[PDB]
Design an enzyme around this catalytic site. Structure first.
Site, mmCIF file in Angstrom:
data_model
loop_
_atom_site.group_PDB
_atom_site.id
_atom_site.type_symbol
_atom_site.label_atom_id
_atom_site.label_comp_id
_atom_site.label_asym_id
_atom_site.label_seq_id
_atom_site.Cartn_x
_atom_site.Cartn_y
_atom_site.Cartn_z
ATOM 1 N N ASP A 197 0.830 -1.193 0.000
ATOM 2 C CA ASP A 197 0.000 0.000 0.000
ATOM 3 C C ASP A 197 0.870 1.249 0.000
ATOM 4 O O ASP A 197 1.904 1.308 0.655
ATOM 5 C CB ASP A 197 -0.870 -0.038 1.262
ATOM 6 C CG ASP A 197 -1.734 1.175 1.421
ATOM 7 O OD1 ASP A 197 -2.671 1.315 0.614
ATOM 8 O OD2 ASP A 197 -1.481 1.960 2.353
ATOM 9 N N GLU A 233 1.609 -0.518 -4.899
ATOM 10 C CA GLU A 233 0.597 0.459 -5.293
ATOM 11 C C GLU A 233 1.276 1.799 -5.493
ATOM 12 O O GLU A 233 1.557 2.523 -4.542
ATOM 13 C CB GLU A 233 -0.497 0.628 -4.244
ATOM 14 C CG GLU A 233 -1.577 1.582 -4.737
ATOM 15 C CD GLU A 233 -2.174 2.499 -3.691
ATOM 16 O OE1 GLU A 233 -1.624 2.679 -2.597
ATOM 17 O OE2 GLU A 233 -3.252 3.055 -3.989
HETATM 18 CL CL LIG Z 1 -4.350 -1.297 -5.774
#
Ligand SMILES: [Cl-]
Ligand SMILES: *[C@@H]1O[C@H](CO)[C@@H](O)[C@H](O)[C@H]1NC(C)=O
Ligand SMILES: [Ca+2]
EC number: 3.2.1.1
Length: 496
Positions: A197, A233
């Site tokens: 993330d 990401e």
């Molecule tokens: Cl994603």
């Protein structure tokens, strides 16, 4: 870090967004295994802030309190049970690793957390890790607010707080080691990889230093020396200094241009047209295919305020969405992730959904079970896109055609297009406002093939459209613009 570690011949992951561990375990056994899915991206499995204003939003799970495996999806024993059961049927688990930050700096101190751990954001005190003020980037960030203010300054994007989220000092060996301790706990449980993330908010080299501390995958299920799959990401739509290519030495990257552009094309915004997709892939400015994790929508941008804004197609746009997902799953570019969502009471005011915070289906904050209806859809407001015939059958299409080249492209100069995957599959799309009736070269062996969009091959028959391929490889396709699904897909395993 680039290989998914799925079984050979399984080519997609599904994001079972906000699902409980016990429901994922069951889903592995009853559906994902028999229907050929490679694995599951789970919601963050570590303890997060319990946010009550607003009531239990999805985004509370992106505000860590500790690395205890204790969330609204379940506890550690339940998490392990899911990983074991999924691995035992050959369906992998990928963890959403929230490692850039802890919670918002203005969250009130106390035990409003999913495992009841104490934390004090204002004093930088997360004793269940433990982290203290020494472990955050307060001193390193140079902005006047302490938050990220300007994405044209690549340093503050990494060293300052993303919308006030306390930013971990990822240069420090102690911090890297606490993150690796968490991730290695998960690897040793049996997880196959990670979504990292907020990777744009981390330095490539700090990510690398963390990854260098990670174990190989659990050798009870995986061959010796298997590295966790890493997909970072990184939102990179161009026009900012940070480029996702800076992260290629660590793993794959999310290619957010993919769904943004595919949405614009399928919506026919700004004069875009499906005929332009002939050179889909790097020709559209995308990362190399072998570094791409692709998707039509994700959990954040399906709410309309993410990377791609309003162009992103979602389950709410079901007809166009199935077409977009089908194009993605047929086309060889990237490693594919299918979204699986929940419904919420979306309420647009002035062009923006005021209920975009709403968390998963729940009774008094307790996430609801996924119930399965006789027709194989889900109840309890779970959308279960991955169970839609048109999507599940395209997950299977991608498996069937794995490794075959993009070939036999056709277009009408507008929005009627088709292409094949070697001699193993062929797909035809009509996104124009008129009918598409034409004989096309399919590249397939002669025979009768079931269209897996309108139906299925069951008991040696097709339940929907049938396509007849002649000895020359040609077949006639007819798709009205009024069809329920204006695309047809056939493949070697749908042949009668
Ligand atoms: Cl994603
Ligand atoms: C296919 O459908 C026909 C017509 O309903 C039926 O007679 C036949 O038994 C089915 N199966 C096969 C293998 O032909
Ligand atoms: Ca950071």
């Amino acid at each position: 870090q680039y290989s998914p570690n799925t079984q050979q011949g399984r080519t997609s992951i599904v994001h079972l967004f906000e699902w409980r561990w016990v429901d994922i375990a069951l889903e592995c056994e009853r559906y994902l295994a028999p229907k050929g899915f490679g694995g599951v991206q789970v919601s963050p499995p570590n303890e997060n802030v319990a946010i009550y204003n607003p009531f239990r939003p999805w985004w509370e799970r992106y505000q860590p309190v500790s690395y205890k495996l204790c969330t609204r999806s379940g506890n550690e024993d339940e998490f392990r049970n899911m990983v074991t059961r999924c691995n035992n049927v050959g369906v992998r688990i990928y963890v959403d690793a929230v490692i850039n930050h802890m919670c918002g700096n203005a969250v009130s101190a106390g035990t409003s957390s999913t495992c009841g751990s104490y934390f004090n954001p204002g004093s930088r005190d997360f004793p269940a890790v433990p982290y203290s003020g020494w472990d955050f980037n307060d001193g390193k960030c140079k902005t006047g607010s302490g938050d990220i203010e300007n994405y044209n300054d690549a340093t503050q994007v990494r060293d300052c707080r993303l919308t006030g989220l306390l930013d971990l000092a990822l240069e420090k060996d102690y911090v890297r080691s606490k993150i690796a301790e968490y991730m290695n706990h998960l690897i040793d449980i049996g997880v196959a990889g990670f979504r990292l993330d907020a990777s744009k908010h981390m330095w490539p080299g700090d990510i690398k230093a963390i990854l260098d501390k990670l174990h190989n995958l659990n050798s009870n299920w995986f061959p010796a020396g298997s590295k966790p799959f890493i997909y970072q990401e990184v939102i990179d739509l161009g026009g900012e200094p940070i480029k996702s290519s800076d992260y290629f030495g660590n793993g794959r990257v999310t290619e957010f241009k993919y769904g943004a552009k595919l949405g614009t094309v399928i919506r026919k915004w700004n004069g875009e047209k499906m005929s332009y997709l002939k050179n889909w892939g790097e020709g559209w400015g995308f990362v190399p295919s072998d570094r791409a994790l692709v998707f039509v929508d994700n959990h954040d941008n399906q709410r309309g305020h993410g990377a791609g804004g309003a162009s992103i197609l979602t389950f709410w746009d079901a007809r166009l969405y199935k077409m977009a997902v089908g194009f993605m799953l047929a086309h060889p570019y990237g490693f594919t992730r299918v979204m699986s969502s929940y419904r919420w009471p979306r309420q647009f005011q002035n062009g923006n959904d005021v209920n975009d915070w709403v968390g998963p289906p729940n009774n008094n904050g307790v996430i609801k079970e996924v119930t399965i209806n006789p027709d194989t859809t889900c109840g309890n407001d779970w959308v279960c896109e991955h169970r839609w015939r048109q999507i599940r059958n395209m997950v299977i299409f991608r498996n069937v055609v794995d490794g075959q080249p993009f070939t036999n492209w056709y277009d009408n100069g507008s929005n009627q297009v088709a292409f094949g995957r070697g001699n193993r599959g062929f797909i035809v799309f009509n996104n124009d406002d008129w009918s598409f009736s034409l004989t096309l070269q399919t590249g397939l062996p002669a025979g009768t093939y079931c269209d897996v969009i309108s139906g299925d091959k069951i008991n040696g028959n097709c339940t929907g459209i049938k396509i007849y391929v002649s000895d020359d490889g040609k077949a006639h396709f007819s798709i009205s613009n009024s069809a329920e699904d204006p695309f047809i897909a056939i493949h070697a395993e749908s042949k009668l």
